[PDB]
Amino acid sequence: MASMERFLSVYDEVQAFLLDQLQSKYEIDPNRARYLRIMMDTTCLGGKYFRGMTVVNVAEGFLAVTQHDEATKERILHDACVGGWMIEFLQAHYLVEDDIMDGSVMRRGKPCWYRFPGVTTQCAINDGIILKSWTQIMAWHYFADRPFLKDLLCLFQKVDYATAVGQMYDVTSMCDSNKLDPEVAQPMTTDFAEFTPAIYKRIVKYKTTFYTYLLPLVMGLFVSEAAASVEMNLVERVAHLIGEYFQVQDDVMDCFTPPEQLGKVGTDIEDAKCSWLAVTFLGKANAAQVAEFKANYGDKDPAKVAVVKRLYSEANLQADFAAYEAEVVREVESLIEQLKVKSPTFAESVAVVWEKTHKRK
């Protein structure tokens, strides 16, 4: 698509601004310039650009209904594109650090950054930190004199923190809360009592929905000067509900989509994740199924994973997924109708964002 090439053109411009800055102001040499350009490319590119492109789509909606000079249109789209790359590079930061943390081997068809032979955990941790700095550099440089600067930086901060908090929920999810203790090595849960829908929705709301839905949609608004025309409590509710659905699809795929299509080898049973499949499982299983789950879940052992998969498969979790899906379709359409009151244009951009999610892979 032509729009995605134009989006990528803003990325080249941004990469070129960033590296030229490191050469003229940070005394960087060409080899380290090169190593950071490849790190940037490897960690930021290759995905679908769903988050980044959403910013552009929202602003586009507003430009179709709104009087501007051509130059203002170009300005508005170029800001939406910059803003989008801010979110793509934030994501890039969290995925680098997440793959170190989740013990992961592959992503987007390639080895995780830290697993490249010339990188190692050592560099990649700092590379990830650089990725997020570059998001603030981009903001301060391209939005220097935009009336939305401060609001944009405050919202980005808040989204970044929520994400880090979510990550903390996610990584502490196989542990019993009463056992969390920096002094004592964390033993895996044996009861699985915190594997509940309420806990799962919590984990998911923070680790995924702020940065993948709330941030793109609001940034589209921010860069459009369009925030005072939508109901923000509604933007929050629809973002949190679509992104929760998006995570649930993530979780299903980790288990049941072949690595070839997923392009990232699935580690949820091994890692003992609080996934949608394990929670939904424990919500319908009889006593002996539960006991078999407990003897097997959470271990690298290739045969103990089969047992889990077959439990999941025989429990019929596609029935639960269709009830779940059908109920999300109801609330998402309902929120879309409510956004129509104040903002018909934004409602339609949410409808598009919903449509693309609901159809993914």
Ligand X SMILES: C=C(C)CCOP(=O)(O)OP(=O)(O)O
Ligand Y SMILES: CCCCCNCC(P(=O)(O)O)P(=O)(O)O
Binding site for Mg(2+), by residue number, is 98, 102, 170, 250, 254, 268
**Residue 62 C-beta: closest distance to a second copy, Å:** 26
**Residue 162 C-beta: closest distance to ligand Y, Å:** 10
Answer whether 252's CB lies under 8 Å from 277's CB.
yes
Footprint (CB under 6 A) of ligand X, residues 20-59: 47-51
Half-sphere exposure of residue 80: CA atoms within 13 angstroms, side-chain side: 31
If one asks whether residue 244 binds Mg ion (CB under 5 A), the answer comes out as no
Q: Which is nearer to ligand Y, 61 or 266 (CB)?
A: 266
If one asks whether residue 250 binds ligand Y (CB under 6 A), the answer comes out as yes
Q: Which is nearer to ligand Y, 96 or 282 (CB)?
A: 96
Question: What are the b/e assignments for 40-57, b being 16+ CB within 10 Å?
Answer: bebbbeebebbbbbbbbb
Q: Which one, of 198, 213, 179, lies nearest residue 52 by Cα?
A: 213
Residue 192 Rama label (left phi>0; alpha psi -120 to 50; beta): left
Stretch that binds ligand Y, among 94-102, 133-141, 283-291, 336-344 (CB under 6 A): 94-102
* Partner from Na ion, a second copy, ligand X, none binding residue 161, C-beta < 5-8 Å depending on class: a second copy
Q: Which is nearer to a second copy, 154 or 188 (CB)?
A: 154
Using only C-alpha atoms, what is the Rg of the chain?
22
**Residue 147 C-beta: closest distance to a second copy, Å:** 13
If one asks whether residue 194 binds Mg ion (CB under 5 A), the answer comes out as no
Q: Which is nearer to ligand Y, 143 or 211 (CB)?
A: 211
Using CA atoms, how far apart are residues 262 and 80, in angstroms rounded to an integer? Answer: 29
Site string for a second copy, 88-107 (x = CB under 8 A): ---------x--xx------
Q: Which is nearer to Mg ion, 94 or 346 (CB)?
A: 94
Q: Which is nearer to a second copy, 275 or 349 (CB)?
A: 275
Using CA atoms, how far apart are residues 336 and 140, in angstroms rounded to an integer? Answer: 34
Q: What is the token pair recorded at 3?
A: 């729009």
**Residue 250 C-beta: closest distance to Mg ion, Å:** 4
Q: Measure the N-to-C terminal CA separation of the chain; round to a whole number of Å.
A: 17
Residue keyed to tokens 């879309």? 336
Using CA atoms, how far apart are residues 220 and 346, in angstroms rounded to an integer? Answer: 10
| 3-class SS of residue 48 | coil
Site string for ligand Y, 159-188 (x = CB under 6 A): ----x---x---------------------
Residue of the chain from 102, 160, 194, 244 that contacts Mg ion (CB under 5 A): 102
Site string for a second copy, 26-55 (x = CB under 8 A): xxxx-xx-xxx-xx--x-------------
**Residue 106 C-beta: closest distance to ligand Y, Å:** 10
In degrees, rounded to 5, the angle at the alpha carbon of residue 101 between the alpha carbons of residues 100 and 105 is 50
Q: What is the dihedral of CA 214, 215, 217, 220, to 10 degrees?
A: 160
Distances (CA, A) of 354 to 48, 114, 141, 187: 15, 33, 32, 39
If one asks whether residue 231 binds Mg ion (CB under 5 A), the answer comes out as no
If one asks whether residue 98 binds ligand Y (CB under 6 A), the answer comes out as yes
Using CA atoms, how far apart are residues 207 and 168, in angstroms rounded to an integer? Answer: 8
Residues forming the site for a second copy (CB under 8 A):
22, 26-29, 31-32, 34-36, 38-39, 42, 97, 100-101, 116-123, 125-127, 129-130, 133-134, 136-137, 140, 149-150, 153-154, 157, 160-162, 164-165, 167-169, 171-172, 177-178, 180-186, 202, 206
